[PDB]
Amino acid sequence: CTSIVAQDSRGHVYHGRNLDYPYGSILRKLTVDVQFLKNGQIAFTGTTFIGYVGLWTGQSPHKFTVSGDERDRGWWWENLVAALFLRHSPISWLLRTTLSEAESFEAAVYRLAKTPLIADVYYIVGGTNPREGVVITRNRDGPADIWPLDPLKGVWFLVETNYDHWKPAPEEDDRRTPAIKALNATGQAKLSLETLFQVLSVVPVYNNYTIYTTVMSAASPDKYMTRIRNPS
């Protein structure tokens, strides 16, 4: 996958992601944007596949945006015990529960960071105010690291793919560098939804496994935009 939370020169937080998964030819036909309602009002918006009740990409309007990237670490039997004996929570279900119950960007990063899971994951969260953007590297028991935005220090964007950000990306699957390089060229001044969408369209960040690309901003919920990709 590839999740990106970034902050522009004026202080807006933008969020975009790529969902890379096999079985593309089938899932591109099932991809949908779902607006979960409450008392008639939109309580949050998500993107999933018909028949999949979890969310890997969502947005609570005027609060936060969250997306998830795969983190393969551990052994097969740790997911079995975590799910059966300990009653942990799936990843795509905790991401949706947070979009529904979390009242603020801080409470959304607390739940996503501390709630026990069945497997590891990277939860990339965005907010409505400046400097609100973290990348939660999760264990099954709790958080393993929290990577925050720091514009004044020269870190105005966080690029998460499928590997720990404090380690060198593998040479075989290094989608981090081209996403960083393309973000360096875009510049913190001209960063917008459309310019972020272009970063997620740069090979190999945009690969044959990309099913859809979402770009969103919690402060401007109506600009939530998902585009199904037909890689070639």
Binding site: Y23, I26, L27, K29, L30, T31, V32, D33, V34, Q35, F36, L37, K38, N39, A43, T47, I50, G51, Y52, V53, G54, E70, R71, D72, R73, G74, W75, W76, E78, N79, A83, L84, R87, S89, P90, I91, S92, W93, S100, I118, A119, D120, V121, Y212, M225, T226, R227, I228
Partner: protein
Amino acid sequence: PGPPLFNVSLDVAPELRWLPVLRHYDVELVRAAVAQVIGDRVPKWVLALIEKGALKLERLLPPPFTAEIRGMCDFLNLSLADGLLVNLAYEYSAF
């Protein structure tokens, strides 16, 4: 244009809230998608055991989680075990 946009009221019971969306989709397409994700990733014998002990598996997962899956499988005529396995496709191979 982008993908279709559907509403899903969270005030309707979990089993019924996803059904107005499935009306727009050919049941054959979905059932072929499940069979593609399971048959390719899960061996036939693993699928056999999970199908025999599905209810024991269901008592563990969050109630509203399995209730939304169960209501859709009753609509599409899929086996509840085939519904829980795709909705846990990430947890099945993420290690």
